[PDB]
């Protein structure tokens, strides 16, 4: 029945994107295809073909392990081709960017449950891009993958992407301990200001900025970020002073940015025109 899948891996490919619901209609096809593809027949699966095509809206929605049976049907090249085609369509679903990103990621798990990990593995990068498509799977399932690549190997970059997602997953202290461990390796340079910022340990970032702000003149960032501590520190006078002290260096950027904090600063001390 590979010819069917071959025809379906064609029909599933269909017009990727062109536009969005069509990429989904490509899936809706691919679904109904996979349905009519009958899977391995597996007549029970084959039974669903018309049934899922009856309507069958949520039934037609899954269809989840349909492709599994098909992906379990080998033609591994054709599979890979389809997988690539899928992966391409999944890049097109990364370009979708929404719907399959839900569904395909779902098809990831079930496969990833099946062992079954076979397709495109690791592929985790775009897996993260789907997990960068939207949000919570794009956290929960993502953090998994995120950690998971992190298990293939650590990088501060991972950590950067990583401890972030904890709070993107609202898991605050997990983020910290990572750093806490990461401290024990990664890394001095790794900008713990940005971290402490993302940690919202402001005092630590303060000197951290101060440290780097000792090093050079300011990245508008650093002044901001350092003073972003102070406002988060609640600290005014410095925050007051420094933007008052340095208002000159400001880019219109730094201007627009700091002016806020600056507004916040002088207001903080109940100067007005200063802020104003």
């Amino acid at each position: 029945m590979k010819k069917l899948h071959v025809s379906t891996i064609n029909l599933q490919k269909a017009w990727g994107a062109a536009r969005r619901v069509s990429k989904d209609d490509w899936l809706e096809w691919l679904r109904r295809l996979s349905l009519e593809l009958l899977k391995d027949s597996s007549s029970p699966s084959l039974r669903s073909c018309w049934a899922l095509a009856q309507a069958y809206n949520p039934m037609a929605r899954d269809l989840f392990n349909a492709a599994f049976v098909s992906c379990w049907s080998e033609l591994n090249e054709d599979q890979q081709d389809e997988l690539i085609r899928s992966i391409e369509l999944a890049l097109t679903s990364q370009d979708i960017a929404e719907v399959t990103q839900t569904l395909l990621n779902l098809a990831e798990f079930m496969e990833h449950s099946d062992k079954g990990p076979l397709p495109l593995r690791d592929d985790n990068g775009i897996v993260l891009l789907g997990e960068r498509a939207a949000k919570c799977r794009a956290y929960a399932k993502a953090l998994h993958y995120k950690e998971l690549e992190f298990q293939k190997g650590p990088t501060p970059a991972i950590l950067e992407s990583l401890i972030s997602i904890n709070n993107k997953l609202q898991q605050p202290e997990a983020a910290a301990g990572v750093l806490e461990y990461a401290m024990k390796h990664f890394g001095e340079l790794e900008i713990q200001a940005t971290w402490y910022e993302k940690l919202h340990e402001w005092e630590d970032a303060l000197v951290a900025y101060d440290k780097k702000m000792d090093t050079n003149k300011d990245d508008p960032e650093l002044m901001l970020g350092r003073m972003r501590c102070l406002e988060a520190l609640g600290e005014w006078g410095q925050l007051h002073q420094q933007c008052c002290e340095k208002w000159t260096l400001v880019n219109d950027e730094t201007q627009a940015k700091m002016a806020r904090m600056a507004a916040a600063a002088a207001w903080g001390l109940g100067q007005w025109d200063s802020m104003e």
């Binding site: 609640g234 903080g268 109940g270």
Partner: protein
């Protein structure tokens, strides 16, 4: 709460608000960040930076007095913290049954 009270500042002095500042400053104390609260505690009293340990603590707001005290207990000096208490307690049961109007 700052951002709150920041607003709520624009209208009212902290000098009425003090009670609000407290569990605030308390939670600020519980934030571990005393200074800020302490800074407010100063502004709350408008008197007595940690300057002398000898400053009789002005009773202007006994609770506010009470407030910083256990902060001071929390703080490095729990000696004076214990100390002005009795002093204040002195002042209290002195002031208390005396300054009574029925």
């Amino acid at each position: 709460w700052q951002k709150i009270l920041m607003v709520r500042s624009l209208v009212v002095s902290p000098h009425e608000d003090m009670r609000t500042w407290l569990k605030y400053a308390s939670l600020c104390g519980k934030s571990g960040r005393l200074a800020l609260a302490h800074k407010t505690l100063v502004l709350l009293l408008g008197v007595d930076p940690s300057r002398q340990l000898d400053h009789p603590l002005p009773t202007v707001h006994p609770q506010v007095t009470y407030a910083y005290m256990k902060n001071m207990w929390k703080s490095a000096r729990k000696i004076d913290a214990f100390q002005h208490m009795q002093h204040f307690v002195q002042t209290m049961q002195q002031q208390a049954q005396h300054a009574i109007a029925t």
